[PDB]
Amino acid sequence: QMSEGVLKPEGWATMETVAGLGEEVTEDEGAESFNHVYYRQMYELAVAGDPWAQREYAAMLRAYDKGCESYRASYEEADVDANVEYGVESYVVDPIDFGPSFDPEDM
């Protein structure tokens, strides 16, 4: 159990609409890891004073609000579409497949 190869731990996951403010992004580990510590640093400097940090933190806040309102709008649209497609009925999962048996398999 203690010797099973070269390991690698768990990291930070990023909220995609506020990282790369508005515009679409791509994946890279170093950039996301930079952004997570960068915005905590800019928050501390903006609280201490420092108008250049206050600009960056306010711009991030603007993108954060816009993405959050867009995503709740998408939730409302999906709920309305589901209430149109089915009635007051709900969607039902597939049953689990256990393989063959000497039984009628929908018993």
Binding site: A19, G20, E23, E24, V25, T26, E27, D28, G30, A31, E32, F34, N35, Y38, Q41, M42, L45, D50, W52, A53, E56
Partner: peptide, 27 residues
């Protein structure tokens, strides 16, 4: 006085702009 804080803000802001920007990397 006050020089290292200004240089720190300028350096991490430039490092955010021209490196470590995922929209830049996407384009």
């Amino acid at each position: 006085n006050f020089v290292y804080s200004e240089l720190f803000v300028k350096l991490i802001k430039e490092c955010k702009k021209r490196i470590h920007d995922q929209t830049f990397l996407k384009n």
